[PDB]
């Protein structure tokens, strides 16, 4: 991968691997999420920010601040097959004083056709208090200098599904997987359940009949809390075809995340 000529976006290509495809003989949602993370990490490295998954500047590390996910939204028009080459372009934009947006466009490298797009909201959190913390414009300029000046939106449409609020589904959920436990292999380099594990947990709540007849066009997650190594999680869904999702701690009922998935017939 490489910064673009203007230095305000980053591009990387991948050849889809046989083990990265699922039941529909195309790349899994988890593979797509992993590729989005990979090009984002290579972009952070290329502009001199942390590569630890907090993507920090010098001054954020001084101020005990880290970037954390508020929302992730992925839309897939066509899943690539084993051996397909995909090119992902990614860039960041200001999202108010508290936040940044990271966007991605996924192309079939051979045709140049857009096969998917994604957007994410990040907020600045004090690592000691877990509170959102605003910093002055001079700290923000450290990262805003690596973002396009003129807005580039992967989701330029007026009332984008990517910004649509997710309500809390009412129990009992129509579909549920109770008592899910993270594995060592599910933990990031900070002992928190990684994003691909949340995606897997969300998909566990989908009825098999849907998995057998449909594929996922969009997934939206709003994150509230991290899941710890010893946490036990219930993954719930109901129809809102479209589903609402809710991930909650088995004991307390405390919200981990909520989500929306949209499905298209195979």
Could you list the residues that contact a second copy (CB under 8 A)? 17-19, 21-23, 25, 28, 30, 34, 37-38, 41-42, 51, 82, 180, 183-185, 187, 189, 194, 196, 200, 203-204, 211
1 binding ligand WP2? (CB under 6 A): no
CB of 106 within 8 A of CB of 86?
A: yes
Give the pairing type, strands 2-3 and 10-15. antiparallel
What is the rounded distance in angstroms from the CA atom of residue 172 to the CA atom of residue 3? Answer: 48
Between 15 and 241, name the residue whose CB sits nearer to a second copy: 15
Length of the chain as a residue count: 266
Task: Looking at residues 18 to 37 of the shown chain, list those that interact with ligand WP2 (rule: CB under 6 A).
Answer: 37
Q: Which is nearer to ligand WP2, 105 or 210 (CB)?
A: 105
Q: Which does 243 bind (CB under 5 to 8 A by kind): a second copy, ligand WP2, none?
A: none
245 is known as an active-site residue: no
Query: Are 100 and 94 in contact, with CB atoms under 8 Å apart?
Result: yes
* DSSP labels, 85-134: EEEEEEEEEEETTTEEEEEEEEEETTT--EEEEEEEEEEEEETTT--B--
Query: With respect to ligand WP2, which residue has the nearer C-beta, 27 or 41?
Result: 41
104 near ligand WP2 (CB under 6 A): no
Report how far residue 258's alpha carbon sits from residue 224's, in angstroms, rounded to the nearest whole number. 8
Q: Residue from 11, 115, 118, 146 that binds ligand WP2 (CB under 6 A)? A: 146
Catalytic residues: 190, 192, 227
């Amino acid at each position: 991968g490489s910064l673009e000529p203007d230095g305000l976006s980053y591009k990387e290509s991948f050849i889809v691997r046989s083990y990265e495809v699922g039941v529909n003989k195309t790349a899994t949602v988890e593979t797509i999420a992993n590729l989005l993370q990979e090009v984002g990490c290579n972009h952070a490295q290329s502009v001199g920010f942390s590569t630890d998954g907090f993507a920090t500047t010098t001054t954020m590390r001084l101020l005990r601040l880290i970037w954390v996910t508020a929302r992730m939204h992925i839309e897939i028009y066509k899943y690539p097959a084993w051996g397909d080459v995909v090119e992902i372009e990614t860039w960041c934009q200001e999202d108010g004083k508290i936040g940044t947006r990271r966007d991605w466009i996924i192309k079939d490298y051979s045709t140049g056709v857009v096969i998917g797009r994604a957007t994410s909201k990040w907020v600045m959190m004090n690592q000691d208090t877990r509170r959102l913390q605003r910093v002055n414009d001079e700290v923000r300029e450290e990262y805003l200098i690596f973002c396009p000046r003129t807005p580039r939106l992967a989701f330029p449409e007026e009332d984008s599904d990517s910004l649509k609020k997710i309500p809390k589904l009412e129990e009992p959920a129509q579909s549920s997987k109770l008592g899910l436990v993270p594995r060592r292999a599910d933990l990031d380099m900070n002992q928190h359940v990684n994003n691909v594990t949340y995606i897997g947990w969300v998909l566990e709540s989908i009825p098999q009949e849907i998995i057998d007849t449909h594929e996922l066009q969009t997934i939206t997650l709003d994150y509230r809390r991290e899941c710890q190594h010893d946490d036990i999680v219930d993954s719930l869904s109901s129809r809102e075809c479209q589903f609402l999702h809710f991930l909650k701690l088995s004991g307390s009922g405390l919200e981990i995340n909520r989500g929306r998935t949209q499905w298209r017939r195979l």
